[PDB]
Each structure stands twice: as C-alpha cells, then as structure tokens.
Paper text:
An initial high power laser experiment delivering 1600 µJ (580 nJ µm−2) of laser energy to the sample over 10 ms of 50 kHz PORTO laser pulses showed NO binding with an occupancy of 1.0 (1.80 Å resolution) but with notably different 2Fo − Fc and omit density features to those from subsequent data collections. This high laser power requirement was due, at least in part, to an initial sub-optimal experimental setup where the fixed targets were orientated with the narrow end of the funnel-like apertures facing the laser beam, and with Mylar sealing both sides. In this orientation, the chip acts as an aperture, blocking a significant fraction of laser light resulting in inefficient excitation and causing only part of the crystal volume seen by X-rays to be illuminated by the laser. The unexpected electron density features may therefore be due to laser induced damage (though a loss in diffracting power was not observed) or non-uniform excitation.
A widely applicable approach is the use of photocaged substrates, where the photocage is soaked into the crystal in advance and then activated using a laser pulse to provide uniform initiation of the reaction throughout the crystal. This work characterizes photocage release of nitric oxide and binding of this ligand to two heme protein systems, cytochrome c′-β and dye-decolourizing peroxidase B using a fixed target sample delivery system. In this work, we describe a thorough characterization of the application of the NO photocage N,N′-bis-(carb­oxy­methyl)-N,N′-di­nitroso-1,4-phenyl­enedi­amine (henceforth referred to as NO cage) to room-temperature microcrystals of two proteins: a gas binding cytochrome c′ (McCP-β) and a dye-decolourizing peroxidase B (DtpB). Laser parameters for photoactivation are systematically explored, and time-resolved structures over timescales ranging from 100 µs to 1.4 s using synchrotron and XFEL beamlines are described. We have demonstrated a sample and time efficient approach using fixed targets to carry out time-resolved SSX and SFX experiments with an NO photocage over the microsecond to second time regimes.
Residue numbers in the entry:
A (entry chain B), B (entry chain A): 1 to 136
Write the structure that this text describes.
Amino acid sequence: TKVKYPDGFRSWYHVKSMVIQPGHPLENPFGGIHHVYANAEAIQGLRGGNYPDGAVLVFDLFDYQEDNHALVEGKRKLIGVMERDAKRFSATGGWGYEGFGEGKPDKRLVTDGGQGCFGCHAAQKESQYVFSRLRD
Amino acid sequence: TKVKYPDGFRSWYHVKSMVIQPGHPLENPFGGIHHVYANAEAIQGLRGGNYPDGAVLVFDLFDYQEDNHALVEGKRKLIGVMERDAKRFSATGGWGYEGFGEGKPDKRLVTDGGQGCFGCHAAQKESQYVFSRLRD
Ligand code: HEC
Ligand code: HEC
Ligand SMILES: [Zn+2]
Ligand SMILES: [Zn+2]
C-alpha cells in the first residue's frame, strides 16, 4: 500500500545519468544531476524480460554547483522510487510511486496515491512505464 | 605489468559523477560527463581503510549533447583505470594507470608506463593518489 524505502539502493546497478538544468520543463522539482539505479529484478525488465514483482528503480537527484564550467554534485535533493507489484499497485499500472525528501525515509513527497507521477510515466506504456534504457 | 581491462566494471559501486564543460581547464582531454566506479577492494580503501592489492578504480568518460536545458549522455570516449599493486606498480605510486579508447580492451592508450597520468594524480599523495571521495 505504501512504497517501501529502498534501503541499500546506492550499491545497486547504475543504469544511467542525466543533467536537468534551469529552464527545462522538468526543472520543478526534478532539476539537478540525477542517477538511475536498478535492483536485480529491475535489470531483468530493463534487459527485455517482464518486470517481476519486487523490481525497484530509483531516481537519485542531486543539486549541483557550476564552478569554472564544471558541474559538481552538491546535496541530495530527493529520490524518486518505483516499486513493482502488479496486484498492490494496480491502480497505477503495477508500479508504486513515492518520493523521499533528501533521500530520508521519513520525508514522503507523494500525496495523491502516485497519480501525478503515473500521469507522465503513462506515456511509456509501451515500455512498462520506464523511460530509462540500458546503455553499456 | 600491464593493467587488466576491468571486465564487469559497470556492475561495480558508483562512487560519484562530475561534468566538465568547455572553458574548464581539463576540457582537453577529460571534457564530458564522467562516472567513477570502484570494486570491493577499492571501497575498503575509499572508506578510510587501506587499499588492498587488486583494488581498481574506473573513470568512465562520456561525451554529452545539449538538449533543451538537459545534458544527455552520448558516446563513451574512454575509460581510465587505476589498478592497485604496491610491488608491481611501485614506479607510479603502487597504482598502474591505463586508458582504453572508447572503453575497448584493444584500444590501450598509455605509452609511457603511466608517468603522465601519475604526474597529475601525485598531487593527491596524501589520499593514496585518489581524488574521488565517497559520498552518501
Ligand atoms: C513527466 C512530467 C514526469 C513526471 C511527473 C515524473 N516523471 Fe519520473 N521520469 C521522467 C522521465 C523523462 C524520466 C527519465 C529520466 C532519464 O534519465 O531518462 C523519469 C525517470 C524516473 C525513474 C527512473 C526510471 C525510469 O522510468 O526511467 C523513477 C524511479 C521515476 N521517474 C519516479 C517518479 C516518481 C516517484 C514521480 C512522482 C513523484 C515521477 N517519476 C514523476 C518523467 C516524469
Ligand atoms: C590532471 C591533469 C589529471 C591527469 C593527467 C589524469 N587524471 Fe585521472 N583524475 C583527475 C581528477 C581531478 C580526478 C577526479 C575526478 C572527479 O570526479 O573527482 C581524476 C580521477 C581518476 C580516476 C577515478 C579515481 C580518482 O582518483 O578519483 C581514475 C581511475 C583516473 N583518474 C585515472 C587516470 C589515468 C588512467 C590517467 C592517464 C591516462 C589519468 N587519470 C590522468 C586528474 C587527472
Ligand atoms: Zn530555453
Ligand atoms: Zn558554464
């Protein structure tokens, strides 16, 4: 019913990264450097299989500072989490969506059952609602 | 005494990332988005422990493209590798240095036994020649 905080996500597989700079549509609140991490079961789905129950993807979002044309990671702003469970999260296409302020377990950001997250991720219906792709 | 290509490095622990843009003093040759990875032995060293022989750090460098206020990962330009062996790599501080063009095992880049890489990393004598720091 509630998405579990993904303890230990930092030791998971790093899928990819991207920088969202001021002026981008997603600036509020997804601006900054973000890294995507996937647990073992999520890798399964990324590689072409079905996503099994228990698959977790994390969007790890850092602020950054521009210093002499380098962008340097600052503080973590939040994580976004998608947890796969076809039964429990059926209202939102089988993924549960949560945000944790500053990456802390006690700071839950979503107040609408995850419908707002779901509304945009629904555009990737064809890829099981996941935008990120494996790269080497 | 060649550095081994670090097979499977992409499933290692992601330490940190940084973006180096035009203007920054290191644009040539390290411009792009880079990610740092570490195997289990290197984490022992990064944690404040000592570095076991067999510790490997990888600098994975990507070109990026500007897309509407986002920087998006493009193609891999190269990986830099530091491989810990106090006796084998005595001449450059106990770390062997190698570059692989586009991350390819066949594209070895280093021609001078690693002297040029070591000359800059030698600035970090007091952290055992490693610039990166663990973060959360
Ligand atoms: C469009 C308006 C979005 C809304 C609202 C949300 N997300 Fe999102 N998300 C979006 C894109 C374009 C991406 C890909 C970023 C990239 O580097 O390519 C993402 C990514 C995620 C991920 C990583 C997995 C993936 O689908 O690629 C997670 C775990 C994720 N998003 C979670 C999430 C949550 C919990 C949201 C509401 C708080 C949410 N997203 C909103 C686009 C959009
Ligand atoms: C200064 C002119 C440099 C030269 C020449 C080389 N490297 Fe380097 N390296 C440099 C910095 C400032 C950093 C840290 C980047 C960051 O995000 O903090 C690095 C990092 C590495 C790493 C990751 C481990 C670490 O020390 O932080 C590796 C594996 C590494 N560098 C390898 C490497 C090799 C193989 C080189 C010659 C081909 C080389 N470096 C040159 C600065 C400089
Ligand atoms: Zn604009
Ligand atoms: Zn700039």
